[PDB]
Nucleic acid binder design. Sequence first.
RNA 1: AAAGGAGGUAUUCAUGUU
RNA 2: GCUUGAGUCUCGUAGAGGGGGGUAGAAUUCCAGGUGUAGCGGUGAAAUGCGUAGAGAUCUGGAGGAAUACCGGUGGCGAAGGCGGCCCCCUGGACGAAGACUGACGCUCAGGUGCGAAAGCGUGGGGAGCAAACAGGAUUAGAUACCCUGGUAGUCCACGCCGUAAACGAUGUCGACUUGGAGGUUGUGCCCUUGAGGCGUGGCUUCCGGAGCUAACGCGUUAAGUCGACCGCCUGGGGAGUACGGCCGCAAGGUUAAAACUCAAAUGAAUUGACGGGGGCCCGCACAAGCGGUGGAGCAUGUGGUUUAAUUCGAUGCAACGCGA
Lengths: 153, 117, 70, 67
Amino acid sequence: PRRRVIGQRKILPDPKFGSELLAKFVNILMVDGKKSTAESIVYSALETLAQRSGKSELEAFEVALENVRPTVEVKSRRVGGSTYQVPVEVRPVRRNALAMRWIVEAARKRGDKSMALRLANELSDAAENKGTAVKKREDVHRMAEANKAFAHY
Amino acid sequence: RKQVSDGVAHIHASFNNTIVTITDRQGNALGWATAGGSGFRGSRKSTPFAAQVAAERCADAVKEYGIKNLEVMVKGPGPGRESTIRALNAAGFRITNITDVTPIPHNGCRPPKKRRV
Amino acid sequence: PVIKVRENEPFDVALRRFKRSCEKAGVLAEVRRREFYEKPTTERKRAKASAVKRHAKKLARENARRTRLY
Amino acid sequence: KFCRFTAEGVQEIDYKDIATLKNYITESGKIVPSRITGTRAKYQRQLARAIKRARYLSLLPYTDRHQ
RNA sequence: AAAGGAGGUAUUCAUGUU
RNA sequence: GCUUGAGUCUCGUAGAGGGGGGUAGAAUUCCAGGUGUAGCGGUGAAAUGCGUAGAGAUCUGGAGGAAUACCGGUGGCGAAGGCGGCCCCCUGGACGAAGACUGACGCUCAGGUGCGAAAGCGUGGGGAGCAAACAGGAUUAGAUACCCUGGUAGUCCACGCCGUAAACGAUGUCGACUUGGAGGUUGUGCCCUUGAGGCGUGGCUUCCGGAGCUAACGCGUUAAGUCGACCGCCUGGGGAGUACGGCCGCAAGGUUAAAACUCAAAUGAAUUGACGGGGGCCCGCACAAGCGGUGGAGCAUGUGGUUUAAUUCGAUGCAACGCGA
Ligand SMILES: [Mg+2]
Ligand SMILES: [Mg+2]
Ligand SMILES: [Mg+2]
Ligand SMILES: [Mg+2]
Ligand SMILES: [Mg+2]
Ligand SMILES: [Mg+2]
Ligand SMILES: [Mg+2]
Ligand SMILES: [Mg+2]
Ligand SMILES: [Mg+2]
Ligand SMILES: [Mg+2]
Ligand SMILES: [Mg+2]
Ligand SMILES: [Mg+2]
Ligand SMILES: [Mg+2]
Ligand SMILES: [Mg+2]
Ligand SMILES: [Mg+2]
Ligand SMILES: [Mg+2]
Ligand SMILES: [Mg+2]
Ligand SMILES: [Mg+2]
Ligand SMILES: [Mg+2]
Ligand SMILES: [Mg+2]
Ligand SMILES: [Mg+2]
């Protein structure tokens, strides 16, 4: 805005694992306000990922998210009359949300049948560093490298 | 091939393009590199980062001669004018002299006419 | 603007010193003004008018330094 | 301020006096502006003429350049 | 080169060293 | 007759004032050569152009022309145009101090004479850079331009001609008087220069401002203030600084300078708005960050159009089009 710094809203922790990260993940996954189905899908995918990857659902999820987190994004400044595509370091709060959004979109695209199965496969791919989400992040980093010439603008 | 372990870096930095040339203290040129050869074209070749990468490419080129000491002569009003120096320092020569050799006339020849854009 | 690296002098410090020396010399300003020939009339105008503009602001400060802001 | 020449009542600046001239030229060999140095305008002109003569006589260098 | 901030309407402000 | 106006002399002062002649360094260009290799150049982005016969870059040497960074200043000088490295020769003007001298020798000036930026012309040189014309590449709907790469006259010198400029302070020359302040510059007197200081007295110069004046804007001891001498010029806008004639000019053209006709305004300053591809300050799902749509498909509905005997009428940028209904 112009003249408004409104305080952040009250967000409830996840019931199962008490995770604010997981709560935002559920909200991002949710469509049309169907929170129940979204949370069921999240829980199913997390359980499957736990069993396959490691020991704890939260551990596997965190590992994947970190493997997808972006260091740098690009924005479009407009100073010299023309618009410069410049890289810029992304703040910690935005990192998690961007990673989760990318993961969710990739999960939606994938060809597996169940949504839970799609999410589990995408999370595992992210953990293995071969997923569509990490590919998207790496392409963003590649663009940042391309436009690194404007790193002091 | 003939190791001398000290060179002079002529950094001709115009507005459009930057040319870095490593030469012996006497004047015989050893190796050179430019943003054009670095691949940047136009608005990207007129940027400091291109100057830095051209400096690095030149440093690699003259690596055969094994020069260690390095005095720098920067000439011309170029966009980088400094990224070349930082690139050389990173490449790992001991920078001995930093000298400006911009040719300023004492009211000599008349410059070309002012642009109406 | 000749600079020779001092004994036990960091490279970043020397680089900053060199930029300072270039600034004090005014080399970029000189080349930037000398790139294109201004007409003698243009020079005389664009300088006298700017000088009078400076004088006016000096007067404005010296006068308006005797008023109640609030 | 503190015009040095009028403090001693100096009659004329001598181009043979290199030390003062070196104190009134910059490190590049350019003549220091009178507003900065605080000299009176008359002595400023005299000093400028003397410095130019010294430059011709190669007692002072023209510019901090190749030569 | 641009932006932010400070001082000045800016200068004598020992030299030395640097 | 007189000495107050005017002028002369004595001693100094500052000055890009003028003419002539030398010289210095930086820089650009070119040439020769060494090193070295594939780009250079240029733009908003490109191409023309240049480079393997070796460019651009870098070092050395040489040639040539033009101009004088810094100092540099709402600083100085000159009647105006104008004058800017340093040195010498010739030369003009201004100002200060103290005196001495001449004794109205003064001011202005139609015709006349001279000087008079830049472009231009004639003759002969010179030619680095820049650059009308011109050539090419772009841009664009077009681009006989702005942009880019080249590039001739010219720009420079000598001698002649031209003789105009927003040749402007848009303010003719000279003289007298009328409150102030802050500066700059250049003299000069005195006070202990109590050390860079303090108090005077001149000349030139910038800004602010009082009375007063002015249509207002503003000017304001450098008047556009109060007066005195002489001279030039104006008489509505266009037609028109044009025609004719005269004079000058190698020419380009310059100077002097109308008329018919036509309109009822043309203008100056200032005021309130609106606007600006002027400036600053602030806000709104205005943008940005997001989510979900529309524009693709089928159907509902409104409008346009077309058709019809009638397809009743109205709404039709936003602010009409599931509107009156
Ligand atoms: Mg150019
Ligand atoms: Mg001429
Ligand atoms: Mg001629
Ligand atoms: Mg000729
Ligand atoms: Mg051109
Ligand atoms: Mg006239
Ligand atoms: Mg004028
Ligand atoms: Mg007139
Ligand atoms: Mg006034
Ligand atoms: Mg005529
Ligand atoms: Mg005429
Ligand atoms: Mg005639
Ligand atoms: Mg709102
Ligand atoms: Mg948006
Ligand atoms: Mg359609
Ligand atoms: Mg549709
Ligand atoms: Mg139906
Ligand atoms: Mg009706
Ligand atoms: Mg209807
Ligand atoms: Mg109707
Ligand atoms: Mg509605």
